[PDB]
Amino acid sequence: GGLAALTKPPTFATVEAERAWLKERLVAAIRIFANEGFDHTVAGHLTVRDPENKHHFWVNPFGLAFRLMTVSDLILVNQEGTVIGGGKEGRRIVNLAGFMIHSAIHKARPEVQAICHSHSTYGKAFSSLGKPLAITTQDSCAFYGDVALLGDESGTIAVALQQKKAIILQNHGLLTVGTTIDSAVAWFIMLEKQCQVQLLADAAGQTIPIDEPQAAFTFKELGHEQAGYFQASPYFQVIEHLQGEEYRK
Amino acid sequence: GGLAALTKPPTFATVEAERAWLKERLVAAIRIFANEGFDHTVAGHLTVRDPENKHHFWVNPFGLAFRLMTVSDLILVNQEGTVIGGGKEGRRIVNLAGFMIHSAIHKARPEVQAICHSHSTYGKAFSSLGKPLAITTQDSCAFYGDVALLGDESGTIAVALQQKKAIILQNHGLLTVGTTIDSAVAWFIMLEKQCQVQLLADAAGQTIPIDEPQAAFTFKELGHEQAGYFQASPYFQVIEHLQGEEYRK
Amino acid sequence: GGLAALTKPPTFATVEAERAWLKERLVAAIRIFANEGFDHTVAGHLTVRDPENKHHFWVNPFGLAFRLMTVSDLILVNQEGTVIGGGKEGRRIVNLAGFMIHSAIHKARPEVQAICHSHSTYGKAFSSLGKPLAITTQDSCAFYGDVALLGDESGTIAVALQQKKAIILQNHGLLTVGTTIDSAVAWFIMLEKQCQVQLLADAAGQTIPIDEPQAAFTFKELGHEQAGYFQASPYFQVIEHLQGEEYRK
Amino acid sequence: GGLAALTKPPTFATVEAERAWLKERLVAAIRIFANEGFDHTVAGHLTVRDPENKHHFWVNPFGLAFRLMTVSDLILVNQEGTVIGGGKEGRRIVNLAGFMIHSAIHKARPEVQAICHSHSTYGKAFSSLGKPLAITTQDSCAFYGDVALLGDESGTIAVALQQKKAIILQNHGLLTVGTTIDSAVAWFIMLEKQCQVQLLADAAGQTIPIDEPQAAFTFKELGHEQAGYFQASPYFQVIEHLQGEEYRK
Ligand SMILES: [Zn+2]
Ligand SMILES: [Zn+2]
Ligand SMILES: [Zn+2]
Ligand SMILES: [Zn+2]
């Protein structure tokens, strides 16, 4: 290649083809969250905006294990939380409070196509400290000047997020957004990892922050949406290899 | 759905049908504990009250790996510890001291149908600090005002537990109770996770407690028995998918 | 049962039958160490005294992954380190320095039939602190008054161990001994776990030691060789289920 | 055996045979990194010098998951970064900045045949502290006087590395080099582990360094290139058993 083609979604011939791709991609993302162990109980939601109606969203149904997510399980929800399509008999239900956090962000930011939230271990533990993410590794520079902190309702979270790619919700955990499902997933994986790294390092000693000019330089390379798409790609390759036959149903 | 149906056990046509469901559910719970790595050596017991005789209990047999538990292995024990049914030739034996902790609680609290105890890593490590669980995450609010601490015999533990869903046993580990096997399991999973979270955060820095009104609000949503049932449900879905064919024997 | 039969090895009809049992049991133990992740590089040795000649020992061959150990791979070594039987062409070799640590202990203590050593993560990290194991959990009471600490050659280790079940070797890791392979394995699993627990708890706060009378009481229940045999049993059950077909070859 | 034969690569009849061996070995190494969880996003590169042209290198193609690496995926790159052979249609691309770090080292040190770099969790976290690796375990003595620290461009890293086997790159992670792929891999595995160990121990208390004469003694045994080859060998045995059929394609 041909790197450019690898940093963007494939071309879609029809809106129906795009919808089919996006639903499978959302399921793959949910399966990645289970494979990484990012899920806890029934908390967590991953949404993608429908490609035909911008006020409709595909989401995981409430209570179904991320590890068992399939395309047939996804439900369609309108902006106000009404379940209007998809799913299986017996679980055409959405976690409303959780969904309306996403809905508020999708409404505020038209370019945001996907949002990820889960009560992952390290993000949760780090969020209990009410500290900003320290920019102490090359990988963390994806978040330089681009991660919010709420010292904590849907409106309040959307306002706090502004135009940033991610937010640390105090005493709660992590939420990320993307122009693609893929980039939102990359940002969640990377943020959970850097929270893990900070908990390890801060317990052991005193970190040295990356000098800000170097952090800015690295952000140009790692922090934009095409870079996010590419940085997520090996996780999607692997989950398709491991569980694609299962989750495509 | 139909969320209400998902937060309660299925209806049982006969007492025999209920017993068959409960034995399989107890085995699934034991298999979840092994899959989560909550077990250590031969410590640990999970009990469920028999649906016909309130003074009889199904329990794992002493020394059998949780990872290999099957319905045929479970033994029936009366209130005073006599093995009176079930099991396989050669292992119709109960860990008595451990069982009588459960027996004392079941006797004191008729609504408690299931009790979980295991020497899980993070609960054990946290219990060695003799500190109450800090309410620092949304998930931890399931335990707001509802987790005991014993600064440590069966009677003493039952008295310390009072009407709460869980107890941290100093220098020992965790024990949880439920009106269902499912809720007892949810509380154990959630408590082990929050102990892990507190060990991570306390090593790294100073946590910020959730403001008490917010904790109380979240407890109303996460802390009751139907919520416990629902919060456990993905773990039972997954373990059935992974190992159901094995453990149903 | 029938608990007594579960706390001792089976009866052996002939010395040949005993040797076959012990070789398979040693392989199972080595496979458990790999499954627990206790191994690192090519470090580590597990030995069992031959049942016919007390000056001969079965041991893993140098450089073979614990994960791939089979009965056919084990080699027979005399007291002075000469490889005198067993193994496969191309790897009839023993790690001599490591083996002679075991040899010195086997010589000093005729009742010691099995010895385990591996550079496991938590034992290694804890050993770098040059501190005695704190008795802060019920499980740790298996080591109450019965674990040595060397502030560190084979003779020096044997002298430091005295009649105890285990030793923490400063800047090195853990070594355990048993009257059976099973009990030596239980002590290693339990000691590695308690080192993990102490590292977690000490990083987070101040532990509270178990009161010594309570520790002594619990040691009577957990610390003797029959209890060790029983406490190891679920690990052997599981590894046989997972990998027995492989490792029996 | 026959230990000497186990500490060196097999003899190669032709340059073509050597190239085939080395490509498979590089893929096995990449698969080990995935199996150990050393990879993160699309970061990381492992290179081996071509056996016919010393200015040509085999490397993983940019963006392909380490877990899915196969011999057919590897690409051939010249000293200046031009992709000149190998790979599959659509991913004949190299991460240039990352590769030129390797290129600078390969140019400076003709004996270095293989270089490993990945953004592994513990190396990354430890590198954020800007501290030298403490020599506190027997395993760590492989790095006694032989690991660099850059208080951080390709030239700067090569200069900082000097003739040492490994370097801790501040705020970045780990890089190792070897006269063989195998030894470079051993050094990476061992360095990542010792970073993990130091983070654990430093959080818990005060480590005791190994006395320098003892560290020097142990380095003679663990720190040379033949020892590295042997110390890596169980990881290659295991990954071939688990995934060889996949990655040989
Ligand atoms: Zn949430
Ligand atoms: Zn207990
Ligand atoms: Zn050793
Ligand atoms: Zn890098």
Side-chain angles (χ1 to χ4, degrees):
Chain A
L3 178 59
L6 297 172
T7 68
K8 305 171 195 166
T11 307
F12 306 113
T14 65
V15 172
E16 293 177 351
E18 183 174 3
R19 182 181 289 116
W21 169 269
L22 290 171
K23 289 179 68 181
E24 180 191 354
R25 204 64 164 176
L26 184 61
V27 171
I30 293 161
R31 288 273 185 142
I32 286 160
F33 274 47
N35 194 66
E36 297 293 326
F38 292 165
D39 49 348
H40 190 56
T41 69
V42 295
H45 8 89
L46 285 76
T47 55
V48 64
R49 197 188 297 274
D50 187 82
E52 184 167 24
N53 189 325
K54 67 188 169 185
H55 302 299
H56 293 175
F57 307 88
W58 295 94
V59 64
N60 55 296
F62 201 18
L64 180 62
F66 285 14
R67 170 64 176 81
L68 305 173
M69 196 64 45
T70 72
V71 166
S72 290
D73 295 302
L74 298 186
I75 49 167
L76 182 66
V77 179
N78 65 14
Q79 197 91 47
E80 54 262 46
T82 308
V83 179
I84 57 167
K88 294 179 185 171
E89 191 55 25
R91 204 189 293 279
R92 288 168 176 146
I93 52 169
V94 69
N95 165 14
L96 186 63
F99 172 77
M100 293 306 293
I101 292 174
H102 291 218
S103 184
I105 297 165
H106 285 293
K107 188 200 305 136
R109 298 178 52 181
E111 84 280 1
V112 166
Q113 297 304 289
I115 303 175
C116 303
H117 173 65
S118 193
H119 294 187
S120 51
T121 301
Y122 299 115
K124 174 164 50 175
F126 184 68
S127 80
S128 73
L129 301 174
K131 295 179 174 185
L133 190 78
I135 307 303
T136 58
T137 68
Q138 179 173 309
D139 295 323
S140 76
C141 291
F143 300 102
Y144 171 72
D146 209 33
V147 55
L149 177 62
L150 181 55
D152 237 21
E153 185 278 334
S154 50
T156 297
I157 291 168
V159 166
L161 179 67
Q162 308 182 343
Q163 304 300 312
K164 296 184 174 70
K165 61 164 58 70
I167 183 164
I168 301 181
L169 305 166
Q170 188 181 299
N171 307 118
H172 186 176
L174 310 177
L175 178 151
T176 62
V177 306
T179 62
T180 59
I181 295 159
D182 302 53
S183 66
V185 168
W187 308 142
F188 199 99
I189 290 165
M190 295 179 76
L191 186 56
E192 174 70 4
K193 180 57 64 179
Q194 187 59 32
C195 287
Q196 184 186 4
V197 164
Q198 180 154 359
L199 292 162
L200 284 162
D202 282 5
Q206 177 61 60
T207 56
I208 304 177
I210 292 170
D211 196 23
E212 285 236 355
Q214 286 62 25
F217 177 86
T218 304
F219 178 88
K220 190 177 184 182
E221 319 289 50
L222 301 186
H224 58 79
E225 287 296 292
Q226 284 179 261
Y229 195 92
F230 193 65
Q231 283 167 297
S233 64
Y235 300 92
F236 285 92
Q237 296 157 28
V238 171
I239 202 65
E240 184 173 299
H241 176 72
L242 297 175
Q243 288 171 24
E245 295 187 11
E246 292 182 3
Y247 70 65
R248 284 164 161 187
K249 296 181 179 182
Chain B
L3 178 59
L6 297 172
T7 68
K8 305 171 195 166
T11 307
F12 306 113
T14 65
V15 172
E16 293 177 351
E18 183 174 3
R19 182 181 289 116
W21 169 269
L22 290 171
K23 289 179 68 181
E24 180 191 354
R25 204 64 164 176
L26 184 61
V27 171
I30 293 161
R31 288 273 185 142
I32 286 160
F33 274 47
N35 194 66
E36 297 293 326
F38 292 165
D39 49 348
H40 190 56
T41 69
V42 295
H45 8 89
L46 285 76
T47 55
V48 64
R49 197 188 297 274
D50 187 82
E52 184 167 24
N53 189 325
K54 67 188 169 185
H55 302 299
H56 293 175
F57 307 88
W58 295 94
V59 64
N60 55 296
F62 201 18
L64 180 62
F66 285 14
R67 170 64 176 81
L68 305 173
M69 196 64 45
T70 72
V71 166
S72 290
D73 295 302
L74 298 186
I75 49 167
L76 182 66
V77 179
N78 65 14
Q79 197 91 47
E80 54 262 46
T82 308
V83 179
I84 57 167
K88 294 179 185 171
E89 191 55 25
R91 204 189 293 279
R92 288 168 176 146
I93 52 169
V94 69
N95 165 14
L96 186 63
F99 172 77
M100 293 306 293
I101 292 174
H102 291 218
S103 184
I105 297 165
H106 285 293
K107 188 200 305 136
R109 298 178 52 181
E111 84 280 1
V112 166
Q113 297 304 289
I115 303 175
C116 303
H117 173 65
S118 193
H119 294 187
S120 51
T121 301
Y122 299 115
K124 174 164 50 175
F126 184 68
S127 80
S128 73
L129 301 174
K131 295 179 174 185
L133 190 78
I135 307 303
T136 58
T137 68
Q138 179 173 309
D139 295 323
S140 76
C141 291
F143 300 102
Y144 171 72
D146 209 33
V147 55
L149 177 62
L150 181 55
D152 237 21
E153 185 278 334
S154 50
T156 297
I157 291 168
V159 166
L161 179 67
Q162 308 182 343
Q163 304 300 312
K164 296 184 174 70
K165 61 164 58 70
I167 183 164
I168 301 181
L169 305 166
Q170 188 181 299
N171 307 118
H172 186 176
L174 310 177
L175 178 151
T176 62
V177 306
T179 62
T180 59
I181 295 159
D182 302 53
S183 66
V185 168
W187 308 142
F188 199 99
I189 290 165
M190 295 179 76
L191 186 56
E192 174 70 4
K193 180 57 64 179
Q194 187 59 32
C195 287
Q196 184 186 4
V197 164
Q198 180 154 359
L199 292 162
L200 284 162
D202 282 5
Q206 177 61 60
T207 56
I208 304 177
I210 292 170
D211 196 23
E212 285 236 355
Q214 286 62 25
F217 177 86
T218 304
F219 178 88
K220 190 177 184 182
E221 319 289 50
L222 301 186
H224 58 79
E225 287 296 292
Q226 284 179 261
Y229 195 92
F230 193 65
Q231 283 167 297
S233 64
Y235 300 92
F236 285 92
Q237 296 157 28
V238 171
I239 202 65
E240 184 173 299
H241 176 72
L242 297 175
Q243 288 171 24
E245 295 187 11
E246 292 182 3
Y247 70 65
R248 284 164 161 187
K249 296 181 179 182
Chain C
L3 178 59
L6 297 172
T7 68
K8 305 171 195 166
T11 307
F12 306 113
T14 65
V15 172
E16 293 177 351
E18 183 174 3
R19 182 181 289 116
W21 169 269
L22 290 171
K23 289 179 68 181
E24 180 191 354
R25 204 64 164 176
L26 184 61
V27 171
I30 293 161
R31 288 273 185 142
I32 286 160
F33 274 47
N35 194 66
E36 297 293 326
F38 292 165
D39 49 348
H40 190 56
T41 69
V42 295
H45 8 89
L46 285 76
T47 55
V48 64
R49 197 188 297 274
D50 187 82
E52 184 167 24
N53 189 325
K54 67 188 169 185
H55 302 299
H56 293 175
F57 307 88
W58 295 94
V59 64
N60 55 296
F62 201 18
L64 180 62
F66 285 14
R67 170 64 176 81
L68 305 173
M69 196 64 45
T70 72
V71 166
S72 290
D73 295 302
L74 298 186
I75 49 167
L76 182 66
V77 179
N78 65 14
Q79 197 91 47
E80 54 262 46
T82 308
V83 179
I84 57 167
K88 294 179 185 171
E89 191 55 25
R91 204 189 293 279
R92 288 168 176 146
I93 52 169
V94 69
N95 165 14
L96 186 63
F99 172 77
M100 293 306 293
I101 292 174
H102 291 218
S103 184
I105 297 165
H106 285 293
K107 188 200 305 136
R109 298 178 52 181
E111 84 280 1
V112 166
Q113 297 304 289
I115 303 175
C116 303
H117 173 65
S118 193
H119 294 187
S120 51
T121 301
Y122 299 115
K124 174 164 50 175
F126 184 68
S127 80
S128 73
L129 301 174
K131 295 179 174 185
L133 190 78
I135 307 303
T136 58
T137 68
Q138 179 173 309
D139 295 323
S140 76
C141 291
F143 300 102
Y144 171 72
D146 209 33
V147 55
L149 177 62
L150 181 55
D152 237 21
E153 185 278 334
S154 50
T156 297
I157 291 168
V159 166
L161 179 67
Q162 308 182 343
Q163 304 300 312
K164 296 184 174 70
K165 61 164 58 70
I167 183 164
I168 301 181
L169 305 166
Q170 188 181 299
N171 307 118
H172 186 176
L174 310 177
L175 178 151
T176 62
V177 306
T179 62
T180 59
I181 295 159
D182 302 53
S183 66
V185 168
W187 308 142
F188 199 99
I189 290 165
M190 295 179 76
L191 186 56
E192 174 70 4
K193 180 57 64 179
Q194 187 59 32
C195 287
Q196 184 186 4
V197 164
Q198 180 154 359
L199 292 162
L200 284 162
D202 282 5
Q206 177 61 60
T207 56
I208 304 177
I210 292 170
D211 196 23
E212 285 236 355
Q214 286 62 25
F217 177 86
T218 304
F219 178 88
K220 190 177 184 182
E221 319 289 50
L222 301 186
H224 58 79
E225 287 296 292
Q226 284 179 261
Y229 195 92
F230 193 65
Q231 283 167 297
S233 64
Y235 300 92
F236 285 92
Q237 296 157 28
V238 171
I239 202 65
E240 184 173 299
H241 176 72
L242 297 175
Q243 288 171 24
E245 295 187 11
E246 292 182 3
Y247 70 65
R248 284 164 161 187
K249 296 181 179 182
Chain D
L3 178 59
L6 297 172
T7 68
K8 305 171 195 166
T11 307
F12 306 113
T14 65
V15 172
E16 293 177 351
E18 183 174 3
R19 182 181 289 116
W21 169 269
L22 290 171
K23 289 179 68 181
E24 180 191 354
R25 204 64 164 176
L26 184 61
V27 171
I30 293 161
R31 288 273 185 142
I32 286 160
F33 274 47
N35 194 66
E36 297 293 326
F38 292 165
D39 49 348
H40 190 56
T41 69
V42 295
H45 8 89
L46 285 76
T47 55
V48 64
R49 197 188 297 274
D50 187 82
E52 184 167 24
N53 189 325
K54 67 188 169 185
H55 302 299
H56 293 175
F57 307 88
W58 295 94
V59 64
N60 55 296
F62 201 18
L64 180 62
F66 285 14
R67 170 64 176 81
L68 305 173
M69 196 64 45
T70 72
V71 166
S72 290
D73 295 302
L74 298 186
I75 49 167
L76 182 66
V77 179
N78 65 14
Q79 197 91 47
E80 54 262 46
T82 308
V83 179
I84 57 167
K88 294 179 185 171
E89 191 55 25
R91 204 189 293 279
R92 288 168 176 146
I93 52 169
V94 69
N95 165 14
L96 186 63
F99 172 77
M100 293 306 293
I101 292 174
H102 291 218
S103 184
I105 297 165
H106 285 293
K107 188 200 305 136
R109 298 178 52 181
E111 84 280 1
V112 166
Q113 297 304 289
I115 303 175
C116 303
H117 173 65
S118 193
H119 294 187
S120 51
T121 301
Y122 299 115
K124 174 164 50 175
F126 184 68
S127 80
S128 73
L129 301 174
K131 295 179 174 185
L133 190 78
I135 307 303
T136 58
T137 68
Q138 179 173 309
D139 295 323
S140 76
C141 291
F143 300 102
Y144 171 72
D146 209 33
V147 55
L149 177 62
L150 181 55
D152 237 21
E153 185 278 334
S154 50
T156 297
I157 291 168
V159 166
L161 179 67
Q162 308 182 343
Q163 304 300 312
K164 296 184 174 70
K165 61 164 58 70
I167 183 164
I168 301 181
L169 305 166
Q170 188 181 299
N171 307 118
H172 186 176
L174 310 177
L175 178 151
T176 62
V177 306
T179 62
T180 59
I181 295 159
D182 302 53
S183 66
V185 168
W187 308 142
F188 199 99
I189 290 165
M190 295 179 76
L191 186 56
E192 174 70 4
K193 180 57 64 179
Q194 187 59 32
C195 287
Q196 184 186 4
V197 164
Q198 180 154 359
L199 292 162
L200 284 162
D202 282 5
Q206 177 61 60
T207 56
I208 304 177
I210 292 170
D211 196 23
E212 285 236 355
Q214 286 62 25
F217 177 86
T218 304
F219 178 88
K220 190 177 184 182
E221 319 289 50
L222 301 186
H224 58 79
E225 287 296 292
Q226 284 179 261
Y229 195 92
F230 193 65
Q231 283 167 297
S233 64
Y235 300 92
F236 285 92
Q237 296 157 28
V238 171
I239 202 65
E240 184 173 299
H241 176 72
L242 297 175
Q243 288 171 24
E245 295 187 11
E246 292 182 3
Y247 70 65
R248 284 164 161 187
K249 296 181 179 182

PDB file of all heavy atoms in Angstrom, chain A residues 117 119 172, chain B residues 138, ligand 1:
ATOM      1  N   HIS A 117     -18.567   3.985  26.205  1.00  0.00           N
ATOM      2  CA  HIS A 117     -18.486   4.112  27.641  1.00  0.00           C
ATOM      3  C   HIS A 117     -18.588   2.741  28.297  1.00  0.00           C
ATOM      4  O   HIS A 117     -19.437   1.935  27.942  1.00  0.00           O
ATOM      5  CB  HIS A 117     -19.594   5.021  28.156  1.00  0.00           C
ATOM      6  CG  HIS A 117     -19.685   5.067  29.645  1.00  0.00           C
ATOM      7  ND1 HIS A 117     -18.680   5.578  30.441  1.00  0.00           N
ATOM      8  CD2 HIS A 117     -20.658   4.652  30.488  1.00  0.00           C
ATOM      9  CE1 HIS A 117     -19.038   5.487  31.710  1.00  0.00           C
ATOM     10  NE2 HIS A 117     -20.233   4.915  31.769  1.00  0.00           N
ATOM     11  N   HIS A 119     -17.372   0.724  32.342  1.00  0.00           N
ATOM     12  CA  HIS A 119     -16.776   0.917  33.660  1.00  0.00           C
ATOM     13  C   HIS A 119     -15.537   0.048  33.808  1.00  0.00           C
ATOM     14  O   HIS A 119     -15.491  -0.874  34.612  1.00  0.00           O
ATOM     15  CB  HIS A 119     -17.806   0.624  34.741  1.00  0.00           C
ATOM     16  CG  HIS A 119     -18.948   1.592  34.746  1.00  0.00           C
ATOM     17  ND1 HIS A 119     -19.916   1.596  35.726  1.00  0.00           N
ATOM     18  CD2 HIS A 119     -19.273   2.590  33.888  1.00  0.00           C
ATOM     19  CE1 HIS A 119     -20.794   2.550  35.466  1.00  0.00           C
ATOM     20  NE2 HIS A 119     -20.421   3.175  34.365  1.00  0.00           N
ATOM     21  N   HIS A 172     -16.351   7.539  38.282  1.00  0.00           N
ATOM     22  CA  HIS A 172     -17.245   6.899  37.332  1.00  0.00           C
ATOM     23  C   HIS A 172     -16.430   6.085  36.340  1.00  0.00           C
ATOM     24  O   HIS A 172     -16.486   4.846  36.353  1.00  0.00           O
ATOM     25  CB  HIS A 172     -18.111   7.968  36.651  1.00  0.00           C
ATOM     26  CG  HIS A 172     -19.171   7.426  35.746  1.00  0.00           C
ATOM     27  ND1 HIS A 172     -20.083   8.241  35.111  1.00  0.00           N
ATOM     28  CD2 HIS A 172     -19.474   6.159  35.369  1.00  0.00           C
ATOM     29  CE1 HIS A 172     -20.898   7.503  34.376  1.00  0.00           C
ATOM     30  NE2 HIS A 172     -20.553   6.234  34.521  1.00  0.00           N
TER      31      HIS A 172
ATOM     32  N   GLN B 138     -19.195   4.872  41.007  1.00  0.00           N
ATOM     33  CA  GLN B 138     -20.613   4.610  40.830  1.00  0.00           C
ATOM     34  C   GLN B 138     -20.944   3.162  41.196  1.00  0.00           C
ATOM     35  O   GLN B 138     -21.898   2.900  41.929  1.00  0.00           O
ATOM     36  CB  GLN B 138     -21.016   4.911  39.398  1.00  0.00           C
ATOM     37  CG  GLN B 138     -22.468   4.647  39.114  1.00  0.00           C
ATOM     38  CD  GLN B 138     -22.868   5.122  37.740  1.00  0.00           C
ATOM     39  OE1 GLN B 138     -22.608   6.265  37.370  1.00  0.00           O
ATOM     40  NE2 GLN B 138     -23.489   4.238  36.964  1.00  0.00           N
TER      41      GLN B 138
HETATM   42 ZN    ZN E   1     -21.496   4.718  33.428  1.00  0.00          ZN
END
